[PDB]
Design an enzyme around this catalytic site. Structure first.
Site, PDB file in Angstrom:
ATOM      1  N   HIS A 162     -10.778   4.977   2.647  1.00 39.47           N
ATOM      2  CA  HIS A 162     -10.068   4.252   3.688  1.00 39.47           C
ATOM      3  C   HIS A 162     -10.273   2.735   3.673  1.00 39.47           C
ATOM      4  CE1 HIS A 162      -8.486   3.470   7.757  1.00 39.47           C
ATOM      5  NE2 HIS A 162      -7.903   4.652   7.662  1.00 39.47           N
TER       6      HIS A 162
ATOM      7  N   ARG B   1      -2.437  10.701   7.006  1.00 40.65           N
ATOM      8  CA  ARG B   1      -2.387  10.038   5.705  1.00 40.65           C
ATOM      9  C   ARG B   1      -3.720  10.114   4.975  1.00 40.65           C
ATOM     10  NH1 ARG B   1      -0.880   4.077   5.857  1.00 40.65           N
ATOM     11  NH2 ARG B   1      -0.417   4.417   3.638  1.00 40.65           N
TER      12      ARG B   1
ATOM     13  N   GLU C 183       0.795  -1.219   0.000  1.00 43.09           N
ATOM     14  CA  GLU C 183       0.000   0.000   0.000  1.00 43.09           C
ATOM     15  C   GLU C 183       0.831   1.274   0.000  1.00 43.09           C
ATOM     16  OE1 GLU C 183      -1.902  -0.381   4.200  1.00 43.09           O
ATOM     17  OE2 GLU C 183      -1.678   1.770   3.827  1.00 43.09           O
TER      18      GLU C 183
ATOM     19  N   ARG D  15      -5.591   5.884  -0.957  1.00 42.34           N
ATOM     20  CA  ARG D  15      -4.437   5.006  -1.110  1.00 42.34           C
ATOM     21  C   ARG D  15      -4.430   4.297  -2.451  1.00 42.34           C
ATOM     22  NH1 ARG D  15      -4.389   6.943   3.173  1.00 42.34           N
ATOM     23  NH2 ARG D  15      -4.488   6.090   5.304  1.00 42.34           N
TER      24      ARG D  15
END
Length: 96
Positions: A85, A65, A54, A69
C-alpha cells in the site's frame, strides 16, 4: 527511495495482467486505475505532476483494491510495484 528492481515473473500473476491492460490503455477494472499518482510522500524520484499514474494489481478474493499497485513513470519501461500500500516500491523488469 526505491527498494531495488524485481523481475516481472517474480511478481504475482496479476501484475502481468495489469501491465497488459496498461499496454492497451485499458479498459481497467477499477475507476481509480489510470489516475495521476502524486508521489505525495516522495518515495519515488521527484517529477512534475502527471509523470506518474497508478493502477490496481488485483488481490485474489479482495472486496477492495487491496494493497498491490503498479505506478507507471512516463519514461520508457519505467514501472514500480508496491505490495504494501505505497510503503515501498520496486522497479519492475519486464525482460525477466
Amino acid at each position: 527511495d526505491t527498494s531495488g528492481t524485481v523481475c516481472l515473473s517474480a511478481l504475482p500473476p496479476e501484475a502481468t495482467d495489469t501491465l497488459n491492460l496498461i499496454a492497451s490503455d485499458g479498459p481497467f477494472p477499477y475507476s481509480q486505475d489510470g489516475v495521476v499518482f502524486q508521489n505525495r510522500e516522495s518515495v519515488l524520484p521527484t517529477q512534475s505532476y502527471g509523470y506518474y499514474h497508478e493502477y490496481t494489481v488485483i488481490t485474489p478474493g479482495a472486496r477492495t483494491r487491496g494493497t498491490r499497485r503498479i505506478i507507471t513513470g512516463e519514461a520508457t519501461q519505467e514501472d514500480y510495484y508496491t505490495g504494501d500500500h505505497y510503503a515501498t516500491f520496486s522497479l519492475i523488469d519486464q525482460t525477466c
